[PDB]
């Protein structure tokens, strides 16, 4: 598996399999590999959602959530550095 995954845009597999087995015994139905893939998908979704919340944060023009104003500077700096690179 190592060989194959390194040959495919980059240890990690073993780490995922541990969580897979954890979910296997705890939850009926899920086995090693199944729950591992599921957890990988969960990790992708989680980070996508965090990015989405930071997007809710970057004040703009149409909707602005009720938030706190200090990290506005940090999120503005980060989103500007992102925008200076094309990125759509």
């Amino acid at each position: 598996e190592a060989f194959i995954l390194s040959d495919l845009y980059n240890i990690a597999a073993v780490e995922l399999l541990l969580i897979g087995e954890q979910q296997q015994p705890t939850f009926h139905g899920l086995t090693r590999g199944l729950v591992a893939i599921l957890l990988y998908w969960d990790g992708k979704s989680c980070m996508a959602e965090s990015l989405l919340h930071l997007i809710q944060a970057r004040k703009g023009k149409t909707f602005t959530l009720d938030h706190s104003p200090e990290v506005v500077s940090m999120v503005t700096r980060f989103t500007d550095d992102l925008m200076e690179q094309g990125l759509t």
């Binding site: 550095d81 200076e84 690179q85 094309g86």
Partner: protein, 456 residues
């Protein structure tokens, strides 16, 4: 990773530039090592479009167009022959059939062979006449530059007859600078072929109107960049290409070393700033602008000590991944507002002791750590010979701190010199406080007297 290949490229380039002894081809060096399919094609395209004879004024001059056409047409001929080795004149004919004497001469044109062109020329010079002589003059002038009378003859000739054989029309027009508006390629009108014939047969239609999505950005890692070589334009597009960030950085850095790059390379270094500040430095090697970048980026990336060095317990600069530079570092680090950092910068640069005094003024009366740190900087300056006024001031801070610890005493008093029992002690205190050679605040004496009264 590929960032690291581009990194080693940057470090080597910067070390060479620092030496300033040998002007080697860093463009060739990096491209090669980094490529070692996007990398291969793009770096071969960079070398093969930029390998022309050797700023802005020179670019504006026609000299640039000549070297562009040289590298481009030679690369096109070479790729056509490297495809021809698959058919391996036989490849040219079997290719006229892969799509399905002017055909053989056009094949020689598209394979780069004036020799084969003249061969098929002398072969069919029976009915075509003066085309053989005009081609011979084209092959005698190295840049394929025809006589002006000959080129006017070719213009009027293609206007007269070839206006309605397509190969004859293409040859007569491209050779006599004729049909400049037309030159439409019926035989070759498909992607790569169309683009190749288009160059063989302006800049605004080529950059804006032709576009890259038409020129097939896929093969453009060797092709559209080559057609443009639109330098900063190719660099912008391939910088927008994800898998070509470090590649675009390397090509642009090669060109600029050959003479907003600031924002471009700054964003490109903000990528691997979190692990490879060494790569941040190898990138800074092209960059007072370099001092401003050092100040800002050092702290932004990580600890300033990690990105510049440590004014160690001895005060030597354990160098990170010049006196005025470190002094402006001390000033900007003072102004950074971070006490420890400003103190480090000023100490590396009077500045150490002054920062120590500003810090120890609040932590005298984190208090023990402020006392220890102020006294440590004090012992450093005093032992190394830095002045007596500030040194004794630090001694005073240490004395006051110890006396305050006792108040919260014996050695403090020594250095400063260098109900009936209760009422007796009140009166002893009144006597000491009144006969002491120290003229203290009258309000303390008023309150000692009020305590004495409320004890009375």
């Amino acid at each position: 990773n590929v960032e690291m290949a581009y990194a080693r490229q940057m470090y080597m380039y910067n070390e060479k530039v620092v030496s300033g002894h040998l002007q080697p081809s860093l463009v060739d060096l990096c491209t090669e090592a980094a490529e070692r399919k996007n990398v291969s094609d793009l770096w071969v395209m960079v070398k093969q479009m930029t390998d022309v004879p050797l700023t802005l004024k020179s670019r504006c001059s026609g000299q640039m167009q000549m070297a562009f056409v040289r590298q481009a047409l030679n690369y096109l001929e070479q790729s056509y022959k490297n495809y021809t080795l698959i058919s391996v004149y036989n490849l040219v004919r079997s290719f006229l059939n892969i799509r399905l004497v002017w055909a053989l001469i056009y094949y020689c044109m598209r394979c780069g062979d004036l020799m084969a062109a003249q061969q098929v020329v002398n072969r069919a010079q029976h009915q075509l006449g003066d085309f053989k002589n005009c081609f011979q003059e084209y092959i005698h002038n190295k840049d394929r530059r025809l006589s002006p009378t000959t080129e006017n003859k070719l213009r009027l000739h293609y206007r007269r007859a070839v206006r309605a054989d397509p190969y004859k029309r293409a040859v007569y027009c491209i050779i006599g600078r004729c049909d400049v508006s037309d030159n439409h390629s019926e035989v070759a009108d498909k992607t790569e072929d169309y683009l190749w014939l288009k160059l063989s047969q302006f800049q605004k239609q080529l950059f804006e109107d032709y576009g890259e999505s038409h020129f097939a950005v896929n093969q453009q890692p060797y092709l559209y960049f080559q057609v443009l070589f639109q330098f900063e334009a190719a660099i912008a597009f391939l910088f927008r290409l994800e898998r070509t960030r470090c590649h675009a950085v390397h090509v642009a850095l090669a060109l600029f070393e050959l003479k907003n790059f600031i924002r471009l390379l700054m964003l490109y270094t903000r990528k691997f700033e979190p692990t490879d500040p060494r790569e941040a430095l190898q990138y800074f090697y092209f960059l007072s602008m370099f001092l401003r970048c050092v100040s800002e980026l050092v702290i932004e990336s990580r600890e300033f000590d990690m990105l510049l060095g440590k004014l160690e317990k001895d005060g030597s600069r354990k160098p990170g991944a010049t006196k005025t530079i470190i002094n402006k570092v001390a000033s900007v680090a003072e102004n950074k507002g971070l006490f420890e950092e400003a103190a480090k910068l000023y100490d590396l640069a009077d500045k150490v002791l002054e920062l120590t005094n500003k810090l120890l003024s609040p932590v005298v009366s984190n208090r023990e750590r402020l006392k220890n740190m102020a006294l440590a900087i004090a012992e450093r300056y005093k032992s190394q010979g830095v002045e007596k006024s500030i040194n004794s001031t630090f001694y005073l801070l240490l004395d006051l701190i110890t006396f305050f610890d006792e108040y919260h005493i014996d050695l403090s008093f020594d250095v400063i010199e260098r109900d009936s029992v209760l009422r007796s002690q009140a009166r002893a205190l009144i006597t000491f406080a009144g006969m002491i050679p120290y003229r203290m605040s009258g309000d303390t004496n008023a309150r000692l007297v009020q305590m004495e009264v409320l004890m009375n």
